Amino acid sequence: MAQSTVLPMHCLYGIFLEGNLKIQKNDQEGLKKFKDNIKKFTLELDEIDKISPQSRIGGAICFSSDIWDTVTKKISKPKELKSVNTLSSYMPGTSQRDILIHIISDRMDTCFKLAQDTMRNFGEDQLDIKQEIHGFRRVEERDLTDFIDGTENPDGDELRTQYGLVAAGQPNEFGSYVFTQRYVHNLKKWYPEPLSVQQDTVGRTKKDSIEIPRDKRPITSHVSRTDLSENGKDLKIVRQSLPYGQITGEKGLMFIAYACSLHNIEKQLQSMFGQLDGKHDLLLKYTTPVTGSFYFAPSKKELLEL
Amino acid sequence: SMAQSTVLPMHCLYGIFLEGNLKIQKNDQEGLKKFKDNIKKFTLELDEIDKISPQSRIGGAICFSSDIWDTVTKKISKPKELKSVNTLSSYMPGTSQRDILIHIISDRMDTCFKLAQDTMRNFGEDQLDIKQEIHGFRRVEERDLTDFIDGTENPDGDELRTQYGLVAAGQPNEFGSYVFTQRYVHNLKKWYPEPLSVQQDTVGRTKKDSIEIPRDKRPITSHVSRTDLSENGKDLKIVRQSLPYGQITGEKGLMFIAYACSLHNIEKQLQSMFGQLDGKHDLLLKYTTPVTGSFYFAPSKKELLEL
Ligand code: HEM
Ligand code: HEM
Ligand code: NA
Ligand code: NA
Ligand code: NA
């Protein structure tokens, strides 16, 4: 019932296309063509899945709060959706765009085919793409800090539905709130740090990703900043982030999270960027966010009913 | 009796291309010793990745220009045909001769990137000044971004790829290879609207199945007519390992690379494509532009370790 980037795990490739919609609010012919291109996307996902099951292909189209009432008069706007630019007073790099296309695959050739076919369908007359990122998994699923990324991601369809998708029975059920944020790593500053400093920074051991006990790591360790609870309930999220970039140039982490509630993501951002106790995440000494956007990925049904 | 491991294998899904200049000076014997230690580490890490990830079909080569040859070795004789590609600048655009090429191929990006990253960390910025890093990837049906299949007439199998790709046994520098790299930027806004008949006239094969257009029905300036060359009844075949690269919404094209037993096999095709043989240019050059270019020699594994 959901679009197909939230529940599956361990993709090897991801393509991220973020940009703005060029169709105006009352161009009904252009908006009909735009929705025909959305339909073609969902059909091509199915066709690639049938021909290349080994790809474990997945894809989602997601919309910002600012563009919501341009693309639909029928579906109610998700209750928590807002522009990420409202965080610009404390979080650098915000760059809210209208549209996200996120495609995942275990093969680059099918990842790229769907991304390219989709962009050719929409065309430069409908989409103004501001960012295109080719993410790829590294050996042992390590981020470029060379720590394993993903250890405490929720596992399995049951938990990833609970934390990644709007609950059944609620408005916009089986959609997801989405946050994207491109980080540029400063590995020249990170590599010389002793293992003890690197593990204090993250909050887990480097070789095996064993959690360091809460009382033995700083409260500004990354795990202490992001493992948060409210009213005895964990504010978990579903991350699909991947490394990207050039060995001899700019590189980092293309962060993306899917969540049942935007609050689960935003409270972690308040924590990491010093807005809850005046202290920043230790990881931010070594990496910098340079883009940012909030979106909502509708359910498959609402995507086709816009 | 072993070549470096990027010439003979076929159908890689990923390739990383690192091209740049050597910062070690001819007299710096301690620096050259460390440079050669890092070369040995590259050959050892290739073996280790092959052991741990046989599914990657990993391959790698380090290749040297004629300008840098006598800096890196006093012992191995310079390959007799090697020269700088900048000597072609009077007729071929985009020449940019560099000292060193590192070419890594894999069926998985994670092991491709691991070897490339580890290798660049070993050499470091104080030894290598990298001018270009390209992440190539195979597309569905092995099509170039023109959406024609690329590779139909590449030689198949170890025997023919040894014949056309490697210096012959018994010759100086046996089992090394002459190498040519050239990055192309495609003008797909210009190419996409062209009628199918124009596209097939340009390449010289059919788009759907890569069936050769009969010679009598295709232009002498078609790409296949320009590159299918012979001399004294012998075909001047080469071993291509080119891959697409780039951004859907930005700059994209083909990262061209060829390996050959003789630089002449490559250079005569360049003379053909760029108008030096008969004044006529390859039709493909109306839709794509070369923006880098370099000639190198990839030594045999033995000569690589004995520089
Ligand atoms: C440079 C950017 C980032 C890097 C390199 C990074 C890396 C990591 C690593 C290594 C872990 C530990 C392994 C794991 O459990 O996954 C982790 C955990 C986590 N990260 Fe990040 N992360 C980054 C940014 C973010 C951001 C922006 C958020 C939230 C919006 C986030 C949320 C989390 C969460 C929720 C966990 C799991 C915490 C737990 O319950 O134990 N991370 N991250
Ligand atoms: C934009 C750059 C280029 C593109 C898109 C391109 C594309 C192609 C295509 C589609 C084919 C036909 C299928 C095949 O047999 O592989 C082909 C054949 C070939 N290409 Fe290229 N090519 C390019 C540049 C070059 C260059 C620079 C050379 C030589 C240095 C070269 C040498 C060849 C050769 C030798 C063949 C096979 C000819 C035969 O014996 O039938 N190509 N190329
Ligand atoms: Na692939
Ligand atoms: Na792979
Ligand atoms: Na590239």
Author numbering:
A (entry chain A): 1 to 306
B (entry chain B): 0 to 306
Paper passage:
A novel cytoplasmic dye-decolorizing peroxidase from Dictyostelium discoideum was investigated that oxidizes anthraquinone dyes, lignin model compounds, and general peroxidase substrates such as ABTS efficiently. Dictyostelium DyPA is a dimer, with each monomer exhibiting a two-domain, α/β ferredoxin-like fold. In solution, Dictyostelium DyPA exists as a stable dimer with the side chain of Asp146 contributing to the stabilization of the dimer interface by extending the hydrogen bond network connecting two monomers. The active site of Dictyostelium DyPA has a hexa-coordinated heme iron with a histidine residue at the proximal axial position and either an activated oxygen or CN− molecule at the distal axial position.
The structure of Dictyostelium DyPA in complex with an activated form of oxygen was determined to 1.7 Å resolution. In the asymmetric unit, two molecules of Dictyostelium DyPA were found. The Fe (III) is hexa-coordinated and is in the plane of the porphyrin ring. The heme group has His222 on its proximal side, and the distal side is occupied by Asp149, Arg239, Ser241, Leu253, and Phe255. The sixth coordination position at the distal face of the heme iron is occupied by an activated oxygen molecule with elongated bond distances between the oxygen atoms of 1.7 and 2.4 Å in the two monomers. The observed distances between the coordinated oxygen atom and the heme iron in the two monomers are 2.3 and 2.6 Å. The other oxygen atom is coordinated by a hydrogen-bond network that involves Asp149, Ser241, an ethylene glycol, and water molecules. Electron density analysis revealed excess electron density on the Nδ atom of His222 imidazole, which exceeds the maximum level of electron density on the carboxyl group of Asp281 by ~1σ. This observation suggests that the imidazole ring of His222 is negatively charged in the crystal structure of the Dictyostelium DyPA:O2 complex, while the carboxyl group of Asp281 is protonated. The negative charge on His222 explains the elongated bond length in the activated O2 molecule by the decreasing effect of an additional electron on the energy difference between the highest occupied (HOMO) and lowest unoccupied (LUMO) molecular orbitals of the complex. Arg239 forms hydrogen bonds with the distally positioned heme propionate, Asp149, and the O2 molecule.
